[PDB]
Each structure stands twice: as structure tokens, then as C-alpha cells.
Design a protein around this nucleic acid. Structure first.
Length: 69
RNA sequence: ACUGCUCUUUAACAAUUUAUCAGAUCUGUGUGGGUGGCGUGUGGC
């Protein structure tokens, strides 16, 4: 459920994998809808992004009509 | 007095030869690191 905190286990935050992947997320597009804590190595989510913050080259109404025809 | 009478609406371009569909790293202050050469002399064994 949104408004939740998730992280990696407390004994694995010095890894090459974790540091690399977190720096990678830092180098990607930073979500305003997901508070990413690259120092705390975690994510806190509040609410799913609305019509404004998603991809604009995608079809879902067509998928809805294909699944509902 | 006694060389001196319009000339006519502002700078005035270099770029150049297959060729394409563009084609992860943003760290430390753990620490070693912050007088002799020669000569001469004496004496000893």
C-alpha cells in the first residue's frame, strides 16, 4: 500500500550491488512521487502517480476496450 | 597681401566532396613521514 517505507536488509548496504544500483537510481530520473533515499538506501512511497507523471506514448483506453469488448 | 573651395548618405562571406536516418565515477586521515668525516697526538694491550 502507498505511504510505506521499504529498504534493503541492514547487513547488505555496503555491497557493490547496492551502492552501484543506488547510484544508478540517483543517475536516472528522480521521482517526485517516490522519496528515494540514496543515503538511507530506501524508498518511501505516498500515492500512485496520476495522469501527469507517466509515459505519454502508451495506450490503455485501447487496452481497456480490447479487454472489455 | 600671396601654401588652404565639396572627393557627394559606413565594416562589405570564410565556410566544400560517401553518405548519415544521426548512429557506470561524484569516499576517507589506520600508520610507519610531519651532528659526522678526516688528520694529529697520547695511552693501552
Amino acid at each position: 500500500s502507498p505511504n510505506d517505507v521499504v529498504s534493503i536488509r541492514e547487513k547488505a548496504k555496503k555491497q557493490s550491488r547496492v551502492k552501484a544500483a543506488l547510484e544508478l537510481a540517483e543517475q536516472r530520473e528522480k521521482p517526485t512521487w517516490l522519496e528515494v533515499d540514496a543515503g538511507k538506501m530506501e524508498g518511501t512511497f505516498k500515492r500512485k502517480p496520476e495522469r501527469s507523471d507517466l509515459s505519454a506514448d502508451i495506450n490503455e483506453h485501447l487496452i481497456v476496450e480490447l479487454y472489455s469488448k
